[PDB]
Amino acid sequence: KRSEELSRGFYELVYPPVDMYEEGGYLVVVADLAGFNKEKIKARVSGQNELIIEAEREITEPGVKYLTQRPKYVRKVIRLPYNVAKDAEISGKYENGVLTIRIPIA
């Protein structure tokens, strides 16, 4: 329960936090994913009902490390509420550390 005991590994299992809602015929997924290179963020729908968000970064921090919680790697699987066009392509934007993915349901 100690804060120094909450590790990068712990955070990988819960990170990034994500909201998902339906709007105007799209499933919208918003993730707080601060501190990544946009080109190292991958999102894909596998099957018809599964969004996978993957990301990686290098973290190099000098000096003596007292806390190390920020995940170097991220892989978040999100079950969509229902099938999305088997091959419905997705759009994504990354701003202020927030990744927004829109997936057409149509």
Next chain:
Amino acid sequence: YLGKELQKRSEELSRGFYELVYPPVDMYEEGGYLVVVADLAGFNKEKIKARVSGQNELIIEAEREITEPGVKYLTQRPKYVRKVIRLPYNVAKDAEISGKYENGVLTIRIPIA
């Protein structure tokens, strides 16, 4: 910190759960400064407040509105954040702390006493 919650459906991992662990922070000491780096995506810089209390506690606080029209399937992003970090060195009782916020990352440098 229970991993017991780690076994629930993602849907049951609520904003309140993430409030208790968010943001993740790295902290290290370099050259007489304590450096704190927080993943704090999607806030207004001016709604981010960091202050030292006593001589060895950093509190990082922030708030935002989240407007999400439509039926929600997942609601994990915290609207409120309050992270308390115990500093391993004492900090100038009367000193300033500078911060920068870029790509959702808050970096705070604090002079070591």
